Amino acid sequence: VDIHVWDGV
């Protein structure tokens, strides 16, 4: 699962 948005966005 991805619990991290787009870094720097």
Q: How far apart are CA 4 and CA 2, in angstroms?
A: 6
Q: Which two tokens stand for residue 9?
A: 């966005």
| Residue position matching structure tokens 């787009």 | 6
Q: Cα 2 to the chain's mean position, in Å? A: 7
Q: How far apart are CA 7 and CA 9, in angstroms?
A: 5
Q: How far apart are CA 7 and CA 1, in angstroms?
A: 16
Elucidated via: NMR
Q: Which two tokens stand for residue 2?
A: 């991805």
Q: How far apart are CA 4 and CA 9, in angstroms?
A: 11
Q: Which two tokens stand for residue 8?
A: 């720097």
Q: Which two tokens stand for residue 5?
A: 């948005």
DSSP 4: -
Q: Which two tokens stand for residue 1?
A: 């699962």
